[PDB]
Design an enzyme around this catalytic site. Structure first.
Site, mmCIF file in Angstrom:
data_model
loop_
_atom_site.group_PDB
_atom_site.id
_atom_site.type_symbol
_atom_site.label_atom_id
_atom_site.label_comp_id
_atom_site.label_asym_id
_atom_site.label_seq_id
_atom_site.Cartn_x
_atom_site.Cartn_y
_atom_site.Cartn_z
ATOM 1 N N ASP A 1 0.814 -1.211 0.000
ATOM 2 C CA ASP A 1 0.000 0.000 0.000
ATOM 3 C C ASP A 1 0.856 1.275 0.000
ATOM 4 O OD1 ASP A 1 -2.054 1.788 0.278
ATOM 5 O OD2 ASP A 1 -2.249 1.452 2.522
ATOM 6 N N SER B 1 -0.057 16.150 -12.127
ATOM 7 C CA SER B 1 -0.222 15.821 -13.571
ATOM 8 C C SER B 1 -0.417 17.128 -14.369
ATOM 9 C CB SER B 1 -1.399 14.847 -13.736
ATOM 10 O OG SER B 1 -1.709 14.649 -15.139
#
Lengths: 6, 329
Positions: free
Chosen positions: B35, B198
């Protein structure tokens, strides 16, 4: 569904 | 040193991925969920309340290398509502042939119901920054942070499969596992995550929009959670798709041929095939399917989960100033 920390 | 381990979907929907982990002496093999969105290594154990165990358990009293960390406790909760707590051992932990000594192994006294119900997951291995670890009074380091002194490069890579096995590598970049080149982008650790921005997105064969999208790379989240305006632009190109209040997201006819989704990494582009965005039927035999791209408004942060990451080869660069790399595959 999974959703990993708070 | 290096390690390389196979990671396998737990079910037919790619809900999560399990990777074997060896704990203790002699090794006890447990299947853990790796994780990149948390920072605790915790396991089902001989301490866990018996009615809450259905999993393979760690027994510290059968491991000759286990040491109680005196006075230390832990308590953690996750975005899907699950939780666990207990006490702390240090022990030897190996992944894919890479061994760390003195790793904190958080032994569950209790686990929440979703963990009891999932027979396939024996605990978690956290790979975010150690500032998020929940041990008190002194926080404990992740398996990756403890491994860096020995690794060939302070990196790990995630190569998740679409309804197929995949790989976690530690310490090296497999140049045969991707196409073109890796583009790297800056990481902020101010919130303890692999957080990046992004440069924008495109839907199907349409135009790329330059818009900054701050989000986290999270292997322990199933789906791709993006800003509401971006998610709406995607499902506008799927003629049967609608948001469902009762099911909890966008749903669409399983018979649809879905458009791809492209995200920006600097000047580079990662293309998620349309089939990856079909998460699967809402129940066996249904004509309706759940979307793999959903709004992040309810979580409060954008999350590049398994739907995005399984379309790429992803490099987690843990140098003193960390960075994140993506390549097509």
């Amino acid at each position: 569904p999974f959703h990993x920390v708070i | 040193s290096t390690g390389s381990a196979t990671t396998t979907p737990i079910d037919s929907l790619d809900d999560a991925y399990i990777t074997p982990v060896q704990i203790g002496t002699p090794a006890q093999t447990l299947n853990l969920d790796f994780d990149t969105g948390s920072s605790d290594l915790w396991v089902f154990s001989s301490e866990t309340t018996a009615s809450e165990v259905x999993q393979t358990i760690y027994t510290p009293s059968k491991s000759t290398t286990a040491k109680l960390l005196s006075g230390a406790t832990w308590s953690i909760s996750y975005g899907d509502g699950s939780s666990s707590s207990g006490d702390v051992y240090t022990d030897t932990v190996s992944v894919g042939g890479l061994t760390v000594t003195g790793q904190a192994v958080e032994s569950a006294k209790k686990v929440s119901s979703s963990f009891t119900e999932d027979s396939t997951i024996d605990g978690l291995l956290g790979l975010a920054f150690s500032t998020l670890n929940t041990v008190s009074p002194t926080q404990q380091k992740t398996f990756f942070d403890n491994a860096k002194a020995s690794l060939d490069s302070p990196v790990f890579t995630a190569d998740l499969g679409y309804h197929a096995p995949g790989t976690y590598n530690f310490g090296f970049i497999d140049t045969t596992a991707y196409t073109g080149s890796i583009t790297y982008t800056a990481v902020s650790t101010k919130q303890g995550f692999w957080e990046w921005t992004s440069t924008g997105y495109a839907v199907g064969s349409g135009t790329f929009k330059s818009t900054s999208i701050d989000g986290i790379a999270d292997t322990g989240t199933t789906l791709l959670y993006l800003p509401a305006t971006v998610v709406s632009a995607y499902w506008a190109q799927v003629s049967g798709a609608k948001s469902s209040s009762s099911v909890g997201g966008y749903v669409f006819p399983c018979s649809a041929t879905l458009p791809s989704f492209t995200f920006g990494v600097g000047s580079a582009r990662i293309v998620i095939p349309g089939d990856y965005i079909d998460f699967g039927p809402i129940s066996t035999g249904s004509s309706s399917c759940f979307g793999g791209i959903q709004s992040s408004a309810g979580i409060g942060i954008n999350i590049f989960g398994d739907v995005a990451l399984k379309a790429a080869f992803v490099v987690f660069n843990g140098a003193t100033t960390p960075t994140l790399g993506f390549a097509s595959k």
